[PDB]
Design a protein around this ligand. Structure first.
Ligand code: CL
Ligand code: CL
Ligand code: CL
Length: 57
């Protein structure tokens, strides 16, 4: 896919996702409906849209 999944940190508002055999930590958005609101929630980096979302559906 273009989507690379991981889990978010509520304290840090980060997403740690897996891509190319490595883990990568990116800030989540600060937007209300994309930030990490629930610790360890699934999150995704989408390298098609060039976006992060820490409230994936
Ligand atoms: Cl790694
Ligand atoms: Cl390496
Ligand atoms: Cl949430």
């Amino acid at each position: 896919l273009s989507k690379y999944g991981g889990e978010c940190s509520k304290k840090h508002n980060t997403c740690t996702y897996r891509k190319d055999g490595k883990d990568h930590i990116v800030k989540c958005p600060s937007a209300d409906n994309k930030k990490c609101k629930t610790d360890r929630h699934h999150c995704e980096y989408d390298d098609h849209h060039k976006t992060v979302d820490c409230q994936t559906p």
